[PDB]
Symmetry: C2
């Protein structure tokens, strides 16, 4: 099961609120922890989602961890972000 | 003075190695700690610079902290990343 360990990747095709919407829904099933991964353009999409999700309550949201590294995507090097999060309420 | 507290903003007009070149030079002056900031497009040039700067040694490089939030830029909201780093050698 995945009650508190939902790892997900963000996209540049989907808007930001689409992931903030799918996130608040997941945190309804007990998903307190979540991981957004993004690349080149999707990289910033993960940010807004969390920023807008932080702007949601800040208290019912916690930043447990975040990391950043680059990898190959389409026979080319690109930057990527690993954004983690935790809910306290 | 600033021997270990160089906060700098990354840009999308230069290049990734342009900021990796200016960084390796700053470290040479004793700048072990550094903070890269970027927005929407530059938010990606900051991660690359570090990822590539890590490809340099890993040991002589350390990730002290990293954060991500959204802010206003040109009467519009944009995503931004705060990337910190520490040199151990």
């Amino acid at each position: 099961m995945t009650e508190k360990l939902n790892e997900i990747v963000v996209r540049k095709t989907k808007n930001v609120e689409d992931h903030v919407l799918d996130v608040i829904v997941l945190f309804n099933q007990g998903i307190d922890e979540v991981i957004l991964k993004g690349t080149g353009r999707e990289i910033s999409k993960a940010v807004d989602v969390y920023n807008s999700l932080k702007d949601r309550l800040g208290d019912g949201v916690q930043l447990v961890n975040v990391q950043t590294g680059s990898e190959v995507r389409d026979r080319r090097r690109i930057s990527y972000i690993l954004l983690r999060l935790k809910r306290v309420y």
